[PDB]
């Protein structure tokens, strides 16, 4: 066997699943609630 396992689980993270990162701030979505006037 060379032949096994293979890599293709590696695949199940190369797809990232969950495209939002806790860097959800990649909006920014937290705002300084810069109100001003």
Same mark, same amino acid.
């Given at each position: 066997? !060379?032949?096994?396992?293979?890599? &293709?689980?590696?695949? !199940?993270?190369?797809?990232?699943?969950? &495209? &939002?990162?806790?860097?959800?701030? !990649? @909006? @920014?979505?937290?705002?300084? !609630?810069?109100?001003?006037?």
């Amino acid at each position: 066997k !060379n032949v096994k396992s293979k890599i &293709g689980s590696t695949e !199940n993270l190369k797809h990232q699943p969950g &495209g &939002g990162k806790v860097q959800i701030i !990649n @909006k @920014k979505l937290d705002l300084s !609630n810069v109100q001003s006037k």
